[PDB]
Amino acid sequence: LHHAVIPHGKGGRSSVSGVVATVFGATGFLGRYVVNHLGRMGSQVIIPYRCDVYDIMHLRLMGDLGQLTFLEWDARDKDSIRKAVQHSNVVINLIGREWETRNFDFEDVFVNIPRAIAQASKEAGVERFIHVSHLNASMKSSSKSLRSKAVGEKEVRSVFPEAIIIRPSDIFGREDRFLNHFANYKTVKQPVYVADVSKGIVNATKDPDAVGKTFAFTGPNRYLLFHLVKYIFGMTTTKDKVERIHISDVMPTDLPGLEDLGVQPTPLELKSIEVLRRHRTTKPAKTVNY
Amino acid sequence: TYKYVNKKEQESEVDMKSATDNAARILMWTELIRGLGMTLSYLFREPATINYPFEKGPLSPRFRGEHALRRYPSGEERCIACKLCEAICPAQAITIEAEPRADGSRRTTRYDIDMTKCIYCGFCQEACPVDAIVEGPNFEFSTETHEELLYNKEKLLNNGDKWEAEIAANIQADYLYR
Amino acid sequence: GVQVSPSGEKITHTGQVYDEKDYRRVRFVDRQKEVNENFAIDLIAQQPVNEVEHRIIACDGGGGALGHPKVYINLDKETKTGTCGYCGLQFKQH
Amino acid sequence: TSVKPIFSRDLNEAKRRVRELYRAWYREVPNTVHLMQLDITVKQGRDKVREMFMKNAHVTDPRVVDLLVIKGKMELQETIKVWKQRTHVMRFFHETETPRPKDFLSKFYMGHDP
Amino acid sequence: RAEYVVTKLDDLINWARRSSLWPMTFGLACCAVEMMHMAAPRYDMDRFGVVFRASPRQADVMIVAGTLTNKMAPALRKVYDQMPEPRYVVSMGSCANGGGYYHYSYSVVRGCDRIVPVDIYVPGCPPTAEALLYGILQLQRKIKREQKLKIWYRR
Amino acid sequence: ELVEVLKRGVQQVTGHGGLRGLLRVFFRANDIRIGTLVGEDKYGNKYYEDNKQFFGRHRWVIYTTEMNGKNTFWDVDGSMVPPEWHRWLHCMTDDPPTTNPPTARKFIWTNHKFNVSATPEQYVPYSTTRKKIHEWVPPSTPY
Amino acid sequence: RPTVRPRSDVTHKQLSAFGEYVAEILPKYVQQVQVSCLDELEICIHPDGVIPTLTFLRDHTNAQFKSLADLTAVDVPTRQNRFEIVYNLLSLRFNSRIRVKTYADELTPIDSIVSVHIAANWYEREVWDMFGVFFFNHPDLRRILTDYGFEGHPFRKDFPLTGYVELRYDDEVKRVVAEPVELAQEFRKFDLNSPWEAFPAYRQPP
Numbered sequence A: 001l002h003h004a005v006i007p008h009g010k011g012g013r014s015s016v017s018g019v020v021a022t023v024f025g026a027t028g029f030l031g032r033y034v035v036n037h038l039g040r041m042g043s044q045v046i047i048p049y050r051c052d053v054y055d056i057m058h059l060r061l062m063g064d065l066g067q068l069t070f071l072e073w074d075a076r077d078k079d080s081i082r083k084a085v086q087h088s089n090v091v092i093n094l095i096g097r098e099w100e101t102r103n104f105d106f107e108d109v110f111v112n113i114p115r116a117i118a119q120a121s122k123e124a125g126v127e128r129f130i131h132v133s134h135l136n137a138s139m140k141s142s143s144k145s146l147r148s149k150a151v152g153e154k155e156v157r158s159v160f161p162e163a164i165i166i167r168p169s170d171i172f173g174r175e176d177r178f179l180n181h182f183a184n185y186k187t188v189k190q191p192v193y194v195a196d197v198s199k200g201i202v203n204a205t206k207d208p209d210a211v212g213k214t215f216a217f218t219g220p221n222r223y224l225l226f227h228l229v230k231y232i233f234g235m236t237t238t239k240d241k242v243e244r245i246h247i248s249d250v251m252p253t254d255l256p257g258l259e260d261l262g263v264q265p266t267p268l269e270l271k272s273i274e275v276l277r278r279h280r281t282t283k284p285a286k287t288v289n290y
Numbered sequence B: 001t002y003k004y005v006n007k008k009e010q011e012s013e014v015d016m017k018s019a020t021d022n023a024a025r026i027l028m029w030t031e032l033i034r035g036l037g038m039t040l041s042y043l044f045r046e047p048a049t050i051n052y053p054f055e056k057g058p059l060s061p062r063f064r065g066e067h068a069l070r071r072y073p074s075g076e077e078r079c080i081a082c083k084l085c086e087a088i089c090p091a092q093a094i095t096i097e098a099e100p101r102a103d104g105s106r107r108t109t110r111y112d113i114d115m116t117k118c119i120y121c122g123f124c125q126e127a128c129p130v131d132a133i134v135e136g137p138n139f140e141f142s143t144e145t146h147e148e149l150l151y152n153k154e155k156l157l158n159n160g161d162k163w164e165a166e167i168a169a170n171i172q173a174d175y176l177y178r
Numbered sequence C: 001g002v003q004v005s006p007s008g009e010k011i012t013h014t015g016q017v018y019d020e021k022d023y024r025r026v027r028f029v030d031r032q033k034e035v036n037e038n039f040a041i042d043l044i045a046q047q048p049v050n051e052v053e054h055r056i057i058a059c060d061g062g063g064g065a066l067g068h069p070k071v072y073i074n075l076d077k078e079t080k081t082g083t084c085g086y087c088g089l090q091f092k093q094h
Numbered sequence D: 001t002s003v004k005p006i007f008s009r010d011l012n013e014a015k016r017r018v019r020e021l022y023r024a025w026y027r028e029v030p031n032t033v034h035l036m037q038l039d040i041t042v043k044q045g046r047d048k049v050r051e052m053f054m055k056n057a058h059v060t061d062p063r064v065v066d067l068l069v070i071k072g073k074m075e076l077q078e079t080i081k082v083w084k085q086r087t088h089v090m091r092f093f094h095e096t097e098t099p100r101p102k103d104f105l106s107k108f109y110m111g112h113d114p
Numbered sequence E: 001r002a003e004y005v006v007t008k009l010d011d012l013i014n015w016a017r018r019s020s021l022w023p024m025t026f027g028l029a030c031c032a033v034e035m036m037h038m039a040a041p042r043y044d045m046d047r048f049g050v051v052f053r054a055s056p057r058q059a060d061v062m063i064v065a066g067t068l069t070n071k072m073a074p075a076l077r078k079v080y081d082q083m084p085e086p087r088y089v090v091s092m093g094s095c096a097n098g099g100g101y102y103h104y105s106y107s108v109v110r111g112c113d114r115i116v117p118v119d120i121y122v123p124g125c126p127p128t129a130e131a132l133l134y135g136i137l138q139l140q141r142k143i144k145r146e147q148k149l150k151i152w153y154r155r
Numbered sequence F: 001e002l003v004e005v006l007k008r009g010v011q012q013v014t015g016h017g018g019l020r021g022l023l024r025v026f027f028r029a030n031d032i033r034i035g036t037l038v039g040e041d042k043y044g045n046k047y048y049e050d051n052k053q054f055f056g057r058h059r060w061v062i063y064t065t066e067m068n069g070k071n072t073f074w075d076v077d078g079s080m081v082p083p084e085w086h087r088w089l090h091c092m093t094d095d096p097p098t099t100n101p102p103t104a105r106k107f108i109w110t111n112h113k114f115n116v117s118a119t120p121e122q123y124v125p126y127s128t129t130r131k132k133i134h135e136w137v138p139p140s141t142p143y
Numbered sequence G: 001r002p003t004v005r006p007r008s009d010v011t012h013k014q015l016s017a018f019g020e021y022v023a024e025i026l027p028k029y030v031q032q033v034q035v036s037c038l039d040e041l042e043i044c045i046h047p048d049g050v051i052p053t054l055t056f057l058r059d060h061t062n063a064q065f066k067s068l069a070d071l072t073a074v075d076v077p078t079r080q081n082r083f084e085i086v087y088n089l090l091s092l093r094f095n096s097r098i099r100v101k102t103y104a105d106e107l108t109p110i111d112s113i114v115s116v117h118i119a120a121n122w123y124e125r126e127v128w129d130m131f132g133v134f135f136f137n138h139p140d141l142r143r144i145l146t147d148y149g150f151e152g153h154p155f156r157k158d159f160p161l162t163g164y165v166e167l168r169y170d171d172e173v174k175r176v177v178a179e180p181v182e183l184a185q186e187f188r189k190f191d192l193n194s195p196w197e198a199f200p201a202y203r204q205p206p
């Protein structure tokens, strides 16, 4: 331990939490909450970015003065990852697309980049690595995204055995591609909240009984896709996206879940009202099990 | 002694002459054409504008701008860590921490100023008994982060080395008034 | 003078360096460490010793004002010099 | 010893003023979640009112009770007239902070919290 | 190459966005008389393209001028939210930079950078209109140094 | 008295390095005035004067097109003005360096640096005081 | 002398005479009349004489103390009645000023004087908001300078300078939340008072 890490304070913005975290995937939708949960307790946060400096200004006010360090990188550029993993204790990976561009295939995104990230982490000498994947991650999958995810989890474990994989399900919040995707206009779903996911990850960042394990972060309830979409329409284009949509959520057996980090599920029936009022110009859904 | 505004010395006359004068004022819109004339006159003058980055506004040898930590001709520092600046600074913006140097002298190890707390009042250079801390002339030191305005001994000494060719002259100018 | 540490960081006029194992070195990444390269402890040593024919000498630093308070120093101890606590100068008795 | 009173002679009259104030609050509560688009449920709001009332139950002094009634009336004014906002009303629930654990061990382990 | 024309397109867009800066002047205190003096002839805010004061609903930049209190923070945040992207912010004065002469008070926000994200900090109590103008030109350059279309192309 | 105005104007136009210099000036500094060259600084900047203009426009400066490795043909800052000329340009004086030179002292910057608010050579703060509390380290051999 | 302030006794005489005048007219509601070195007249009274005394001074022909220059409170936590209350009053017919003081505490309110001077409508609200002192028969009495949900009276001597809470924007809930106070530089308490007595004229006995 180095005195610069001893968690002095009272758990607040201007405190110290001993958490030096290099986070990849902060410009997105879940990092926007991971970084807040990290910084509002007094943690140092290295954020690599490839975007323009305008798209990374919603993060300068979520951490105290001097705790946030924004630097630039390029996935294809190695030696731009040593800079960021060095001087850290924890690394968090949140990268992922819902589609394929020219330069970046699912293979690259979910297998080749995380592997180099974990390699550089191990080289540096960090002590925790957290990777996020999908609940339905499996090689047998209509979608090749999940195929690549289940491949990349192993490709990571092969370099960082003590890593921590986290498989949540369809996530719902503001600026999410699930409820807004449905409301833009045989299968059971158990969604989960970004708040819960971020709390879980930021807790695992310190909890000692989380290494070399996996976690299935799923909501408290389950719904039939039809009942859920009708609930959406009552409160109110990609092949792989539609494929991931037309897949039911597994009920992972005895896998260390969400309430094992300390978090508690927040039912969608409470945050749908705040997420959906934007798309305007009721009774709840009957929870079921198959 | 007092005066009256909006009071007439006595009643007026309802004579046809004055009534017609007021009716002309009303119909012909007389009191407004004079304002039009004022605006035209101003159009036909020279504006007070200046090219900023090329033409600069005038200042005085007393201007209080950016801070600087000075030295002696020898090159030795001046701050003897007496903390009068820290004790008078209204905004509690100066943090100081001193020690005996290996050569046995009263000198600082830490001298920090917070420009997001300084009200730029000059009390620190009024108090310094050695003319070591001075609120220099510079005002063009804006930034993009709140962390480039937390100064320190190094930044302030660099600013001193930078601006001494001007601070010294302004002090030579004004030191006979203080 | 600035002389670098194993980690590759310059040392200051008060011996400050982030230990190679320190996470606070991040702030310098893609950036620099502002350091002054003119060390008073050496620039004053570069100066010579003044000599006087009087066992007591007054120092002010230069200009009456623009210097420092007039202080009086004793020069009876030929073993060493007489140093000023303000300016660092040192005198001798001849 | 003997005192000069304020808006009451005894805790009975004080408590009936309190009950009138509770009537007013309890009744108004839902109009707030309607006017200002709060996420919480009327049940949560009413439980919160009950909690904030019982927080000052040990009180015995008619004067210390009349002053609390005064302040609650000020708040109810600020609320029914839309002078407060979603922020000021949600400043009651503390949705963005964990509490000091009520466990000697949970305190010891992290800090000097006594 | 497409890179040449994309660079030129970004340059043109940035030229427009930086030559037609319209400010919402959230003026709270004695760091606003200086903004007025900057609009005044000797500095002629309107000469670079920066209109005197426009509506908060069609503005591009937002100048926070003076002490921001805990009774005024929500209105400032609501204005920031109502404003249309792409939007920039400029903090004028010690009060808005770190709280200044009231940093240790109970009714002051120790920095507008806790309620909204800032791009350019101008120091002073108060900073001359010359310094505020310097800061606005620094913002102009910050805009001229953007690569939006480039990052969308090489994505 | 109008033809004299036109003559003053044509001489103000042709008073530069022909069309190229005229365009350079008119497009960097939106002004085509003619003044006396009091001096030029190490960094290539020029400083002009005319005492018949009004207070604030009787002195001005044409910045350099390059400063410490930077294309300043368009980008231009009042931070480029070194101190000795800053003091004469903001009218703290009636005397420029050429006649009233500064005091030649070491530890004064020979090369002036402009604002670096975002360049890679900018300022990053830190604590200058050493570690206070030294911990205990046990030996690397047991019992 | 050129460094000392002049000293006229005519004003001391006038104001002592008027003090006797006021005190013998209102032997009730009156105590501790005093006129000071710098020629200012204070009259201390009982909380039951506010409206009587203000009305007397405003309407009485010899007094005509019409303008309410200021209303103030002062916290001295070492006396049972800790909240001194001060009315600074002005008369133009005589070019004169006076101070009327009373006392209060928590739970022991004062009578409002909006009936006498309507300026107090806001001064009394300010006193209630800052020092926590209720007034009887005030139409509206509510937070005027502080935020809407502020819980405390901050101009007391026991309320901390920096407060108990602090505000900031949090993206999760998209609001300006309140939290405990965590500063990055604790305000420094400079102990300045000197050990050596500076004014013997005020030397308290042991």
Ligand SMILES: CCCCCCCCCCCCCCCCCC(=O)OC[C@H](COP(=O)(O)OCCN)OC(=O)CCCCCCCCCCCCCCCCC
Residues within 6 Å of the ligand: B026, B027, B028, B029, B032
């Ligand atoms: C053959 C013999 C008989 C023939 C019959 C005809 C005989 C002539 C009749 C006279 C005609 C009079 C002129 C007609 C228009 C008069 C209108 C008028 O008088 O408006 C009155 C009104 C003010 O009224 P009031 O408020 O009561 O005055 C203050 C009281 N103390 O005033 C106003 O409010 C006006 C507001 C004006 C504000 C804008 C002013 C801008 C002026 C710009 C210059 C315009 C010049 C004209 C431009 C021509 C366009 C090509």
Ligand SMILES: NC(=O)C1=CN([C@@H]2O[C@H](COP(=O)(O)OP(=O)(O)OC[C@H]3O[C@@H](n4cnc5c(N)ncnc54)[C@H](OP(=O)(O)O)[C@@H]3O)[C@@H](O)[C@H]2O)C=CC1
Residues within 6 Å of the ligand: A025, A026, A027, A028, A029, A030, A031, A049, A050, A051, A075, A093, A094, A095, A096, A097, A098, A104, A109, A132, A133, A134, A135, A167, A168, A169, A170, A171, A172
């Ligand atoms: N929500 C869901 O349905 C579920 C999501 N997850 C996981 O959640 C994580 C994040 O979700 P979300 O927040 O929606 O992701 P977002 O798309 O919101 O943002 C993710 C980040 O990935 C970065 N990124 C993506 N592709 C590249 C690339 N080729 N090169 C560099 N950076 C890249 C982007 O950086 P920039 O914005 O700068 O390009 C972006 O900020 C994903 O990793 C996903 O696997 C897991 C289970 C369920």
Ligand code: SF4
Residues within 6 Å of the ligand: B085, B088, B089, B090, B091, B093, B094, B113, B117, B118, B119, B120, B121, B122, B123, B124, B125, B135
């Ligand atoms: S000028 Fe600034 S640093 Fe100096 S005493 Fe005044 S507030 Fe403090």
Ligand code: SF4
Residues within 6 Å of the ligand: B078, B079, B080, B081, B082, B083, B084, B085, B086, B096, B124, B127, B128, B129, B130, B132, B133
């Ligand atoms: S007053 Fe001057 S000498 Fe004393 S501590 Fe401050 S800067 Fe140093």
Ligand code: SF4
Residues within 6 Å of the ligand: B119, E029, E030, E031, E032, E065, E066, E067, E092, E093, E094, E095, E096, E100, E101, E124, E125, E126, E127
């Ligand atoms: S920084 Fe100074 S001048 Fe500016 S608003 Fe605050 S107190 Fe007023």
Ligand SMILES: [Zn+2]
Residues within 6 Å of the ligand: C059, C060, C061, C068, C084, C085, C086, C087, C088, C089
């Ligand atoms: Zn000396």
